[PDB]
Amino acid sequence: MQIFVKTLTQVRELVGGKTITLEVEPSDTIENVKAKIQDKEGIPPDQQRLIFAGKQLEDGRTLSDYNIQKESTLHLVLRLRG
């Protein structure tokens, strides 16, 4: 099962960038997914937030809990911890 991850349109419109493809499973947690993004892009999961269908995803839940299926697109955004 592959899913797509990209930044917001307005971010891409200004600075560009690519859509990342992740090899995932239905039972993968959101923290699993952020780690795969970390492995790919080096971005710390603590500063990552994922969005599907407008709503924020929480770490303990699985992809199947949010009905994220094959070829779904998630949006990735920054969250600074301070």
Curated annotation (Swiss-Prot):
Residue stretches making up the Ubiquitin-like domain: 1-82
Outcome when changing R81K: No effect on ADP-ribosylation
Domain of life assignment: Eukaryota
Subcellular location, record wording: Cytoplasm; Nucleus
UniProt-annotated site: Essential for function, residues: H75
Modified residues (Phosphoserine): S72
Modified residues ((Microbial infection) ADP-ribosylthreonine): T73
Sites marked Interacts with activating enzyme: R61, R79
Post-translational modification as stated in the protein's UniProt record: Phosphorylated at Ser-72 by PINK1 during mitophagy. Phosphorylated ubiquitin specifically binds and activates parkin (PRKN), triggering mitophagy. Phosphorylation does not affect E1-mediated E2 charging of ubiquitin but affects discharging of E2 enzymes to form polyubiquitin chains. It also affects deubiquitination by deubiquitinase enzymes such as USP30. Mono-ADP-ribosylated at the C-terminus by PARP9, a component of the PPAR9-DTX3L complex. ADP-ribosylation requires processing by E1 and E2 enzymes and prevents ubiquitin conjugation to substrates such as histones.
Glycyl lysine isopeptide (Lys-Gly) (interchain with G-Cter in ubiquitin) crosslink site(s): K6, K18, K34, K36, K40, K55, K70
Effect noted on mutating R79G: No effect on ADP-ribosylation
Described purpose of this protein according to its UniProt entry: Exists either covalently attached to another protein, or free (unanchored). When covalently bound, it is conjugated to target proteins via an isopeptide bond either as a monomer (monoubiquitin), a polymer linked via different Lys residues of the ubiquitin (polyubiquitin chains) or a linear polymer linked via the initiator Met of the ubiquitin (linear polyubiquitin chains).
The protein's name in its UniProt record: Ubiquitin
Gene name, Swiss-Prot/TrEMBL: UBA52
